[PDB]
Symmetry: C2
Subunit: 112 residues, 2 copies
């Protein structure tokens, strides 16, 4: 099943794109929860982290490396929080794997 | 002493006890001593990386392995309704131990925003 993130990858609807390569896309979240809140998503349609394959390991790590590079480029020198939600208890909002990166304010504990 | 002398480096070398879920040559999963959810564990690399902001490009496979191990451990622990994975970076991220660690929290509804 296609999702709104598929439409964003395909450039069918607009998003504020931060970075793109051949295998992922980073863009600002439309409902930001911090002064900086962006997403890094694979172009491959992995619906949720629970179904990711072993062969996806380096791709998933690539999301985090891209995320940390984008965070530095966006000036998040005091830190940030990375989040992956899975399923209903995790609060996953779109069934396309996505890494949230939030910063620009103190993030609190517990993380939801 | 490989892994460093943070508490997580000590845990890797079995010098401080921990409730271990899974261990391989690249990482270790163990329960958090101050759980914020009914199930709350960590996955850490055995290689010492202080924080995600200093991870190297060649660390991609290892960082992805933390997530794959995290999701496998969550399934093994029966977290069939889902869970949240968290990496804290620096002061604004709430990081308190400078050895990279992926939190996995589940067994209750997680809320938004994530802190």
């Amino acid at each position: 099943g296609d999702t709104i993130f598929g439409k964003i990858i395909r450039k069918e609807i607009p998003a504020k794109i931060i970075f793109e390569d051949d295998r992922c896309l980073a863009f600002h979240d439309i409902s930001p929860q911090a002064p900086t809140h962006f997403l890094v998503i694979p172009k491959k349609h992995i619906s949720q982290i629970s179904v990711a394959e072993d062969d996806d390991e380096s791709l998933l790590g690539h999301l985090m490396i891209v995320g940390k590079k984008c965070a530095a480029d966006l000036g998040l020198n005091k830190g940030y929080r990375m989040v992956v939600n899975e399923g209903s208890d995790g609060g996953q909002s779109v069934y396309h794997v996505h890494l949230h990166v939030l910063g620009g304010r103190q993030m609190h504990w517990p993380p939801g």
